Scaffold this active site. Structure first.
Site, mmCIF file in Angstrom:
data_model
loop_
_atom_site.group_PDB
_atom_site.id
_atom_site.type_symbol
_atom_site.label_atom_id
_atom_site.label_comp_id
_atom_site.label_asym_id
_atom_site.label_seq_id
_atom_site.Cartn_x
_atom_site.Cartn_y
_atom_site.Cartn_z
ATOM 1 N N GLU A 138 0.860 -1.197 -0.017
ATOM 2 C CA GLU A 138 0.049 0.095 0.016
ATOM 3 C C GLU A 138 0.760 1.303 -0.103
ATOM 4 O OE1 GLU A 138 -2.438 0.865 3.606
ATOM 5 O OE2 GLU A 138 -3.821 1.429 2.507
ATOM 6 N N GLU A 240 -7.928 11.175 2.978
ATOM 7 C CA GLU A 240 -8.247 10.244 4.210
ATOM 8 C C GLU A 240 -8.408 11.103 5.376
ATOM 9 O OE1 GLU A 240 -5.777 6.943 4.385
ATOM 10 O OE2 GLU A 240 -6.819 6.067 6.155
#
Length: 272
Positions: A138, A240
């Site tokens: 990621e 986010e």
């Protein structure tokens, strides 16, 4: 490679007008969803026990084609993202030299919980890694965040937010970036709950507009032994928010790709 200079590249400093209309999504998308008349796809991660979140795509014909707004109230880690979706067993180098021009407004310090991220995001797969932890990656290129009760949104985050280990630094796109590697042990992933690695570049001077030389980050990670492997999943612009109540509102998100001579291979949008 040579910096592209094509006139279709929107100067990020000029994209200062609030966009209007758009299509809004209020629920978890269940992965990538294509956008109509666009090469891009969006994804939303919106937990139902959290409060109301949104992503609004500003469409194919304004803001560079990938611009979006997002809102959150009491999210339980909201992610809204939009950009390239690949996941076709090709390494990042296949996509040549990748760039993203951006310009947004956002809510201020402490409007996104204890942790938050703004910049570029995705995953990549490396089935060739001998260590199974390193087979899935990621990744984040962190241009900005909302700070928290401990640090200003004008100070860069560090290992206190990301976890993991500082590997080094480099300078690109007018700032130093700190490179961090973290291991996520038995955590949710695009491959189910497992162990995988995260790579971060943290911009030391947070900013809300500019150009990201994305491929340069990929080359730098690999050069430090943080390998991405041969199957890139996506390369998207992300907001986010861990918690709080806030907004992100882009006037410009424009991805483009160029060959080594600086010729445009892909740009959005599509005179006498």
């Amino acid at each position: 490679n040579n910096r592209p200079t094509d006139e279709r590249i929107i100067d990020p400093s000029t994209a200062n007008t609030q966009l209007t209309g758009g299509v809004t999504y209020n629920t978890t998308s269940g992965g990538n969803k294509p956008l109509a008349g666009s090469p891009y796809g969006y994804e939303t991660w919106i937990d139902t026990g959290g409060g109301v979140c949104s992503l609004t795509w500003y469409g194919a014909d304004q803001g560079g084609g990938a611009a979006f707004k997002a809102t959150w109230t009491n999210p339980h880690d909201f992610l809204g993202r939009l950009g390239y979706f690949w996941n076709e067993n090709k390494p990042y180098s296949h996509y040549e030299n990748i760039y993203c021009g951006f310009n947004y407004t956002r809510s201020g310090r402490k409007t996104a919980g204890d942790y938050s991220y703004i910049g570029i995001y995705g995953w990549s797969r490396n089935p060739s890694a001998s260590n199974s932890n390193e087979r899935l990656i990621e990744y984040y290129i962190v241009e900005d965040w909302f700070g928290n009760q401990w640090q200003a949104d004008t100070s860069p985050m560090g290992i206190n937010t990301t976890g993991g280990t500082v590997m080094g630094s480099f300078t690109v796109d007018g700032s130093s970036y700190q490179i961090i590697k973290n291991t996520r042990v038995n955590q949710p992933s695009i491959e189910g709950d497992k162990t995988f690695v995260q790579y971060f570049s943290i911009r030391q001077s947070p900013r809300k507009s500019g150009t990201i030389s994305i491929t340069e980050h990929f080359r730098k990670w690999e050069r430090l032994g943080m390998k991405l492997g041969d199957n890139m999943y996506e390369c998207k612009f992300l907001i986010e928010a861990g918690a709080g109540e806030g907004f992100f509102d882009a006037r410009l998100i424009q991805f483009y790709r160029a060959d080594n001579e600086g010729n445009i291979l892909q740009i959005t949008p599509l005179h006498h």
